[PDB]
């Protein structure tokens, strides 16, 4: 079953600048357990996280908190005739985690030759606040609280 | 930036564009430049325009001309069947000839999923 509270999945108190919120996003950027190649993008790169955004090297994501998180989407449906289980009264932890796993591939899937552009393909989207999670909150997250037909099937 | 060979990889590093010239590889494009003094991290386009033309005779001294040893790929198969050996029809039936398995893996010289009826 599932009737049990979770674990010590809250990682660790880190030491660089605090900021356990985006160190987990570095854990989303990295693959194959590789360190000192993903943390060089966020920390050791001194020319792409600054000199282009205008200010504020560490807290670029001020714009990438207020209006970028995907929150509200369907869980899972079987043959389940016409439920449309969008609204759901969703959770802030899932709201953060869908951003942390859905704001990743706007730099990996979008390549560029330069070793200073393919990294911080994402930092301009975080500083400006654009990408694939801005139109999605207007497409998917604005079709639940306006009118009246879907289904009584909830849980 | 013209090369010693024929197919130009369009202005890359001297370890890269000079390599896949026929007759040249990793251990010839790596030692053929450190003797002449070119730093292997530089570009073919950023070479000296005299090093463009004087690094061409060094390649064409000993080994046989481009396409001729590629014809010796088909001619060595001819000379091994001096009496019409069994290795000749090991070659000319579309399969690897070392002795790999050919129902699974080593699907290369066979046509990929070409012919079965059932």
């Amino acid at each position: 079953a599932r009737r049990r509270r979770a674990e010590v999945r809250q990682l660790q108190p880190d030491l660089v600048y605090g900021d356990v919120l985006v160190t987990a996003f570095i854990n989303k950027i990295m693959r194959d357990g590789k360190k000192n190649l993903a943390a060089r993008i966020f920390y050791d790169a001194c020319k792409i996280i600054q000199e282009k955004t205008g200010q504020e090297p560490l807290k670029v994501f001020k714009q990438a908190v207020e209006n970028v998180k995907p929150r509200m989407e369907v869980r899972s449906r079987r043959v389940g005739g016409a439920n449309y289980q969008v609204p759901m009264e969703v959770s802030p932890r899932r709201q953060q985690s869908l951003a942390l796993r859905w704001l990743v591939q706007a730099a990996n899937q979008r390549p560029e030759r330069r070793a200073a552009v393919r990294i911080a393909h994402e930092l301009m989207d975080a500083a400006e606040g654009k990408g694939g999670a801005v139109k999605k909150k207007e497409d998917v997250e604005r079709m639940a609280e306006a009118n009246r037909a879907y289904a009584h099937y909830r849980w | 930036a013209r090369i010693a060979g024929v197919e130009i990889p369009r202005n890359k590093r001297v370890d890269v564009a000079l390599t896949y010239i026929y007759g040249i590889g990793k251990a010839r494009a790596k030692e053929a430049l450190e003797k002449t003094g070119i730093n292997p991290a530089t570009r073919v386009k950023d070479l000296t325009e005299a090093e463009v033309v004087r690094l061409r005779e060094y390649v064409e001294n000993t080994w046989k001309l481009e396409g001729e040893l590629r014809a010796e790929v088909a001619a060595n198969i001819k000379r091994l069947m001096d009496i019409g050996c069994y290795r000749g029809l090991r070659h000319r039936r579309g399969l690897p000839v070392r002795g790999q398995r050919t129902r699974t893996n080593a699907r290369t010289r066979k046509g990929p999923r070409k012919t079965v009826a059932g």
């Binding site: 108190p13 880190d14 030491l15 660089v16 360190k35 000192n36 943390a39 920390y43 050791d44 | -």
Partner: protein
């Protein structure tokens, strides 16, 4: 300099060496950015010292032997925390309010039968 602190992750034989001096943090023959160079978790080591307004007047070099690299940093976060016996372990108002008093015991789990790499196994076939 020789203290009670023995922080053993990664089967690292920990011998931590510190006394009141002048420098912030030292290591065996290097200067904290050449031997510890390579992991970002080594840019700020002395968390039990800097957390209690006792930042940088300790020598804090080591003789630690076993395993890899970041368990030495865990032997600073836990090795200094066991090595504060000079700074009076009856001081119970320096490590208690912060979320600090969980000890490093998370070791990598061992390997079993029918198995490649410690709970990775071949799957079902149904034929």
């Amino acid at each position: 300099e020789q203290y009670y602190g023995t922080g053993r992750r990664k089967e690292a034989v920990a011998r931590v060496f510190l006394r009141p001096g002048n420098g912030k943090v030292t290591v065996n023959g290097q200067d904290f950015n050449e031997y510890f160079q390579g992991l970002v978790r080594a840019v700020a080591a002395l968390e039990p010292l800097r957390a209690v307004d006792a930042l940088g007047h300790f020598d804090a070099y080591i003789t630690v032997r076993g395993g890899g690299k970041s368990g030495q940093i865990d032997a600073i976060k836990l090795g200094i925390a066991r090595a504060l016996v000079q700074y009076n372990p009856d001081y119970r108002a320096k490590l208690k309010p912060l979320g600090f008093l969980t000890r490093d015991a998370r070791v990598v789990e061992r390997k079993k039968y029918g198995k490649h790499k410690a709970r990775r196994a071949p799957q079902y076939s149904k034929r």
